[PDB]
Amino acid sequence: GIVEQCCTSICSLYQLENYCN
Amino acid sequence: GIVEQCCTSICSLYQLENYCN
Amino acid sequence: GIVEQCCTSICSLYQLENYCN
Amino acid sequence: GIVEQCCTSICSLYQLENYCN
Amino acid sequence: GIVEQCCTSICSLYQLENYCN
Amino acid sequence: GIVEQCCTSICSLYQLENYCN
Amino acid sequence: XVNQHLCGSHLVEALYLVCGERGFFYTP
Amino acid sequence: XVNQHLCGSHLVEALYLVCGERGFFYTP
Amino acid sequence: XVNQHLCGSHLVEALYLVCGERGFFYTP
Amino acid sequence: XVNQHLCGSHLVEALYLVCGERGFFYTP
Amino acid sequence: XVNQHLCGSHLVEALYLVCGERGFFYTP
Amino acid sequence: XVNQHLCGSHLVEALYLVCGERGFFYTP
Numbered sequence A, B, C, D, E, F: 001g002i003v004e005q006c007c008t009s010i011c012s013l014y015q016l017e018n019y020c021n
Numbered sequence G, H, I, J, K, L: 001x002v003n004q005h006l007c008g009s010h011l012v013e014a015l016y017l018v019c020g021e022r023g024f025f026y027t028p
């Protein structure tokens, strides 16, 4: 999930965009 | 939507809960 | 009130110190 | 303290109501 | 400035990017 | 920079002022 | 639209807190 | 009022920052 | 401590939201 | 875990901004 | 003006995110 | 890096408030 993906290692805007609808 | 529902008159926590998964 | 004072013209940080303990 | 209680394991909103007036 | 540009009318990400170094 | 200066030990408001224009 | 945008920012923070582990869809 | 709610949110943040270890009351 | 500072910031927000018109004290 | 909770609060805000009119799915 | 002040607070956060390692220039 | 990112978010909000009309450069 987003916490696993983005809270230990940093997420780019593209990676954040994954969670958009 | 939530914006039109909640951005003029304050929505209670209970009303906001309606938008949870 | 802090709302009357500070939501209708900008309160500085200095002014806001008035509301500290 | 609220820091001791809530910065080291997550406090629910219900728990946090304890700190209201 | 950014307030004039982005606080009366809404700014896209591209428009926000203008203010990046 | 500010991050290395201020993200472990808290920077006072005066120290933060050093980064203003 | 700016006011709506500002309000939404606060709404999604509220939803984050109210919804907890269940999460939420934000669909404007 | 949503405007007061949004203003208050920012006020509490500001108070938290300026008041430091002293702390504050928000009792609108 | 920056960790406590950051935690507190979020706590005050949460208190502001849950406490409503009652308000709150943050007196760490 | 509190670090994850604080992280999630920022993540929600970032999604809000990034996703724009598409909105987003927050699943913790 | 308070509406501008609240707007600016969100603008700073948006710049923070959008600009990444480039950083930004906030001039009000 | 995530902790630094979270901290920076709060730093730029603090700078917004402390620096006021003068503004600031955030240059990481």
Ligand SMILES: Cc1cccc(O)c1
Pocket (backbone or CB within 6 Å): A005, A006, A007, A009, A010, A011, J007, J010, J011, J014, K017, L002, L005
């Ligand atoms: C923007 C952001 C916030 C929190 C964690 C991340 O990886 C990215």
Ligand SMILES: Cc1cccc(O)c1
Pocket (backbone or CB within 6 Å): B006, B007, B009, B010, B011, B012, G007, G010, G011, G014, H002, H005, I017
């Ligand atoms: C908590 C919250 C934030 C923004 C709008 C609302 O109606 C309620």
Ligand SMILES: Cc1cccc(O)c1
Pocket (backbone or CB within 6 Å): C006, C007, C009, C010, C011, C012, H007, H010, H011, H014, K002, K005, L017
């Ligand atoms: C810092 C701050 C927030 C909200 C209103 C104000 O006048 C000042």
Ligand SMILES: Cc1cccc(O)c1
Pocket (backbone or CB within 6 Å): D006, D007, D009, D010, D011, D012, G017, I007, I010, I011, I014, J002, J005
């Ligand atoms: C809502 C919140 C913020 C910070 C710590 C907590 O346990 C809970």
Ligand SMILES: Cc1cccc(O)c1
Pocket (backbone or CB within 6 Å): E005, E006, E007, E009, E010, E011, G002, G005, J017, K007, K010, K011, K014
């Ligand atoms: C992202 C954002 C915040 C505030 C105003 C804007 O136009 C855009």
Ligand SMILES: Cc1cccc(O)c1
Pocket (backbone or CB within 6 Å): F006, F007, F009, F010, F011, F012, H017, I002, I005, L007, L010, L011, L014
């Ligand atoms: C006010 C503030 C926020 C984040 C880090 C700091 O050192 C100080």
Ligand SMILES: [Cl-]
Pocket (backbone or CB within 6 Å): I006, I007, J006, J007, L006, L007
């Ligand atoms: Cl944080």
Ligand SMILES: [Cl-]
Pocket (backbone or CB within 6 Å): G006, G007, H006, H007, K006, K007
């Ligand atoms: Cl706002």
Ligand code: NA
Pocket (backbone or CB within 6 Å): A017, A018, A019, A020, A021
């Ligand atoms: Na997606």
Ligand code: NA
Pocket (backbone or CB within 6 Å): E017, E018, E019, E020, E021
């Ligand atoms: Na630029």
Ligand SMILES: [Zn+2]
Pocket (backbone or CB within 6 Å): I006, I009, I010, J006, J009, J010, L006, L010
């Ligand atoms: Zn934070």
Ligand SMILES: [Zn+2]
Pocket (backbone or CB within 6 Å): G006, G010, H006, H009, H010, K006, K009, K010
């Ligand atoms: Zn706001």
